[PDB]
Amino acid sequence: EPYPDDGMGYGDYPKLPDRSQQERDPWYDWDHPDLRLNWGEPIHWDLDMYIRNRVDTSPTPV
């Protein structure tokens, strides 16, 4: 699902779900364990923002 073409410049890039890398299951063997990302997988546009060391969107108890 490409980003809406509103002139922002995203263009072809897909609108990947805004899930912080914390949310992805740690136990699974990732090609990049520290980033919890596999090779060839499309990379979120704001992945750097959603790294485990930065902004986190994991579900809260409250």
């Binding site: 990049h32 364990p33 520290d34 750097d48 060391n53």
Partner: protein
């Protein structure tokens, strides 16, 4: 001044007539000796500048910059040795000659007594830089980057040339001494407003100003390591020196005309540091950091107060050293992994510890950890701005916080975390690379002990 100029000229025949094996060795030896000779200029009489001759003079502003240039040439040679090994002997000699011509032009710019000669050589510096970027860059965007750099600088400079000629016609001389001593005040007129703009805009382009800085990221990312070193260390400071020299003519109108540039720089430092927070390319991150520091220097110059000028000189020298070292550190990893993406190489501290230590010290200087000359300059600029307006402290502190954040973020991403498993080409750091990082660092830490050398004439 010929004690420095003539050996620098003789470097060219020596490089051309040296054997293919010995080009780097001979160049490095003699450039280091030239820097040792240049160290004599640091001794400056407090009241008056060292007027060597009609054409050349030195003050406490020009001397640190000349020392920086003379020190920078051998460092550029050491850095550029590695990636130019495959090049033919003629091409390597041509590269070295471009470096030597650049050093010669820069020395003559900083020592010239006449503003028109300063302009001639300051624009002459473009040709070697452009050739370096467009011939020894490693990406297809080098041509576009060179075009951007050249055309931004020329569009800034040509009105400066017209204005300088007009000043020669009106006042009668462009010698800096005579201009300083006569220095009749300007009047608030549209003609004088446009003269002020013409004089200021060339240097405002050279010092990356927010909205005029687009050339800098392209140039620094696309250029080879040595070209990035000169661009960060001296070519930006060319603008600072020019602005400080030229501010004498435009005394009263500066108060009225500074507000656009002052606000642009004050907001742009925050914007550029925020850009540094989200950059995906290490060279680009360093380039935007340079933009932010140069914006601070622009604020200091525009404020036109003694503490501001001292901080401006200190920041110029300190930033030159820090940015050159940071580019060298990034270039080492680029040579190892052949990509500039920050995320690609991770956990290099385990693989290369001494390089990690160099990265730590470089970042600490970048975030202005005291008593680094970086912090001395930045703090003086902040105090001058506070005297200019107490509200400046909000922006200055925000910029400091973001600088710390992005510096430690670069350090954490590149040098911490789990090592990238698939990358297997990381090898023990060569003695050349560690020597280069040490030659960057040790002078910077040493200058803290005796800070009067880099505090400028107003000290």
């Amino acid at each position: 001044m010929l004690k420095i100029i003539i050996p620098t000229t003789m470097l060219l025949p020596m490089t051309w007539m040296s054997k293919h094996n010995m080009i780097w060795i001979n160049a490095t030896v003699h450039s280091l000796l030239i820097s040792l000779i240049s160290l004599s200029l640091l001794n400056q009489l407090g009241e008056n500048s060292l007027n060597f001759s009609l054409t050349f003079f030195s003050d406490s502003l020009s001397a640190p910059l000349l020392v920086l240039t003379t020190w920078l040439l051998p460092l550029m040679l050491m850095a550029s040795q590695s990636h130019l090994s495959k090049e033919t002997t003629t091409r390597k000699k041509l590269y070295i000659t471009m470096l030597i011509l650049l050093q010669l032009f820069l020395i003559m710019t900083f020592t010239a007594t006449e503003l028109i000669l300063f302009y001639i050589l300051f624009e002459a510096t473009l040709v070697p830089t452009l050739i370096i970027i467009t011939r020894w860059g490693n990406q297809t965007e080098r041509l576009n980057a060179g075009l951007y750099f050249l055309f931004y600088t020329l569009a800034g400079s040509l009105p400066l040339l017209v204005a300088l000629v007009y000043i020669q016609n009106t006042t009668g001389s462009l010698n800096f001494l005579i201009i300083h001593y006569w220095s009749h005040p300007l009047s608030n007129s549209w003609s004088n407003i446009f003269m002020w703009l013409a004089c200021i805009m060339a240097f405002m382009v050279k010092m990356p100003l927010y909205g005029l800085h687009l050339w800098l990221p392209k140039a620094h990312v696309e250029a080879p390591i040595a070209g990035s070193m000169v661009l960060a260390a001296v070519l930006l400071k060319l603008g600072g020196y020019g602005m400080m020299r030229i501010t004498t003519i435009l005394n009263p109108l500066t108060n009225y005309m500074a507000y656009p540039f002052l606000m642009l720089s004050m907001w742009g430092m925050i914007m550029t540091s925020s850009i540094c927070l989200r950059q995906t390319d290490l060279k680009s991150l360093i380039a935007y950091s340079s933009v932010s520091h140069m914006a601070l220097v622009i604020v200091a110059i525009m404020i036109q107060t003694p503490w501001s000028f001292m901080g401006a000189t200190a920041l110029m020298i300190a930033h030159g050293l820090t940015s050159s070292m940071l580019f060298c550190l990034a270039n080492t990893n680029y040579e190892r992994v052949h990509s500039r993406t920050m995320i690609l190489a991770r956990g290099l501290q385990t693989l290369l510890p001494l390089m990690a230590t160099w990265w730590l010290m470089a970042s600490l200087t970048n975030l202005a950890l005291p008593p680094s000359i970086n912090l001395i300059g930045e703090l003086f600029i902040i105090t001058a701005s506070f005297s200019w307006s107490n509200i400046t402290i909000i922006l200055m502190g925000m910029n400091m916080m973001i600088t710390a954040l992005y510096s430690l973020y670069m350090l954490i991403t590149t040098q911490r975390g789990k090592y990238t498993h698939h990358i297997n080409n990381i090898k023990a750091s060569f003695t050349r690379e560690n020597a280069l990082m040490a030659l960057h660092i040790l002078p910077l830490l040493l200058l803290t002990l005796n800070p009067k050398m880099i505090l400028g004439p107003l000290y």
